[PDB]
Design a protein around this nucleic acid. Structure first.
Ligand SMILES: Cc1cc2c(cc1C)N(C[C@H](O)[C@H](O)[C@H](O)COP(=O)(O)OP(=O)(O)OC[C@H]1O[C@@H](n3cnc4c(N)ncnc43)[C@H](O)[C@@H]1O)c1[nH]c(=O)[nH]c(=O)c1N2
Length: 455
DNA sequence: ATCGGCTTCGCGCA
DNA sequence: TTGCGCGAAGCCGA
């Protein structure tokens, strides 16, 4: 393993006991540098590797849809880990408390976790650090080039990150070893209980009939790879031409798996690189999963208020402020956005895509969030509404991409200045008519308009 | 220096 | 829907 995938979080004496992979972001047994490394030090100690996952209370802030997707992924993982003799333990609680204690109870010799740039994980790490004496390591298993290694600063734009990361691709883009099994020697309950809790918040149609359709994306490591393979076969070739058209099912459809780490984004790049397809489509796509994905961890990692106005660039803040008193053509409440009650059938169409498939089309997410900004009482509130709807109803939400994408859409993070307008300042503008020139808006509206049947 | 060149724009034009 | 050119606009970096 390239040792620059590892960082020390805390020194100390190695216990004579097992090596505990604190799985958190990368919920997969295959193509997992964090697990691979864990096993490897457990090989140099002749002690076994275990995996522990913290079932936290944060699931009460999103929906059954996310929770179901994830827990079902885990149930398949625990098998997959058993087949390699790697036991899988599931603590129910707060990880500061629970990881440190489990390190005590199970006499852990070394602790490894994966890398996540989100505020909460660094809170939990600092808490764990205090409550343990053993070595504590971190492995960037979610990015091709480790976040702290790709750049040491916040990147103004993709066109400054991109040389930086392409300079390290040859060293860090590589194949994955095999996960060697342990030489040395309930989840079904937790899903029922939790789903029982989330129920009175479930999004329902006027007939007690749930809104979310669960069959557009089956959860798990297995399903993820079939989605990847069916994308290389059927959709990569058209990607460059149709990635901006919401009427074509032509995206990878990988983001819900990428968020939970049910698949390695590295493996996707490995497969796509070798795929003999249209160059235009490869280059566009590598650009999204490599650059736009990893600049998002970059933003969150170097900007701890990544869900705040104050991480917008100076020009964008100064511009939005100077338009705070402009008359808005419309103002909607979070309740109104949430239910698709704006003047715009295109905007509602896209919210109905979000409510029912739990995944909104890429291009329409940009439109979606810029219109939240344009028809709410203030920047701050637009951001709140946007974040809240993103994270409540996207299978891929609560994720650095989400934040960096909302920040792109509303504060121009990683963008530039455009014509100065009412309300939205010099933020890039997107128009109903611009869409109508780019795709059959009326199809998209057709498909979802019909969901005026909400509780 | 200093100046090209930026995700994902809009819009007229052919 | 098509692609092309041009507009408006702030700032990084070779
Ligand atoms: C307002 C808003 C809101 C969101 C997002 C963007 C915007 C503008 N995105 C980012 C992007 O829209 C989303 O990753 C894709 O639409 C996911 O669908 P596919 O995987 O099919 O995309 P597609 O196959 O076209 O792209 C492949 C992968 O590239 C990455 N990617 C694509 N567009 C990106 C972008 N603009 N920024 C960062 N990475 C990008 C993702 O990892 C994605 O899975 C996001 N993404 C996410 O993971 N979680 C979220 O909650 C959101 N929410």
């Amino acid at each position: 393993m390239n040792p620059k995938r590892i960082r020390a979080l805390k020194s100390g004496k190695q216990g004579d006991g097992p090596v505990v992979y604190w799985m958190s972001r990368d919920q997969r047994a295959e193509d997992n540098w964090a697990l691979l490394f864990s096993r490897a030090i457990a090989k140099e100690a002749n002690v076994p590797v275990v995996v522990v996952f913290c079932l936290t209370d944060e699931f009460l802030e999103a929906g059954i849809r996310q929770y179901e997707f994830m827990l079902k992924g885990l149930q398949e993982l625990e098998v997959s880990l058993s087949r390699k003799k790697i036991p899988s333990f599931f603590l129910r609680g707060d990880p500061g408390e629970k990881i440190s204690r489990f390190v005590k109870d199970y006499n852990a010799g070394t602790l490894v976790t994966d890398f996540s740039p989100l505020r909460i994980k660094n809170q939990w790490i600092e808490k764990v650090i205090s409550g343990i004496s053993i070595p504590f390591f971190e492995v960037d298993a979610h990015n091709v080039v480790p976040c702290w290694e790709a750049s040491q600063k916040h990147e103004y734009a993709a066109h400054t990150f991109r040389p930086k990361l392409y300079a390290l691709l040859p060293e860090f883009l590589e194949e994955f070893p095999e996960l060697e099994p342990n030489s040395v020697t309930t989840l079904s309950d937790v899903l029922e209980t939790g789903v029982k809790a989330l129920l009175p918040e479930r999004a329902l149609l006027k007939n007690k009939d749930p809104l979310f359709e669960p069959w557009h994306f089956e959860p798990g490591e297995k399903a993820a790879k079939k989605v990847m393979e069916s994308f290389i076969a059927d959709r990569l070739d058209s990607y460059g031409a149709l990635r901006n058209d919401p009427t074509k099912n032509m995206l990878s459809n990988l983001s819900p798996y990428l968020h939970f780490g049910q698949i390695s984004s590295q493996r996707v790049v490995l497969e796509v690189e070798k795929a003999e397809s249209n160059p235009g489509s490869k280059k566009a796509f590598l650009d999204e999963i490599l650059i736009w994905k990893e600049i998002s961890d970059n933003f969150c990692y170097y900007n701890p208020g990544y869900d705040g106005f104050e991480s917008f660039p100076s020009w964008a803040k100064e511009s939005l402020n100077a338009h705070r008193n402009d008359v808005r053509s419309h103002i909607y409440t979070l309740e109104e956005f949430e239910a698709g009650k704006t003047h715009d059938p295109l905007w509602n169409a896209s919210q109905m895509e979000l409510l029912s498939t739990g995944k909104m089309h890429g291009y329409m997410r940009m439109y979606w969030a810029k219109k939240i900004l344009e028809w709410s009482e203030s920047p701050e509130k637009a951001l709140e509404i946007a974040i809240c709807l993103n994270d409540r109803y996207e299978l891929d939400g609560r994720d650095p991409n989400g934040y960096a994408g909302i920040a792109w859409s509303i504060g121009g993070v990683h963008d530039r200045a455009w014509g100065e307008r009412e309300v939205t300042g010099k933020i890039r503008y997107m128009s109903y008519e611009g869409c109508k020139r780019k795709f059959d808006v009326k199809l998209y509206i057709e498909k979802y308009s019909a969901l005026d049947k909400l509780a």
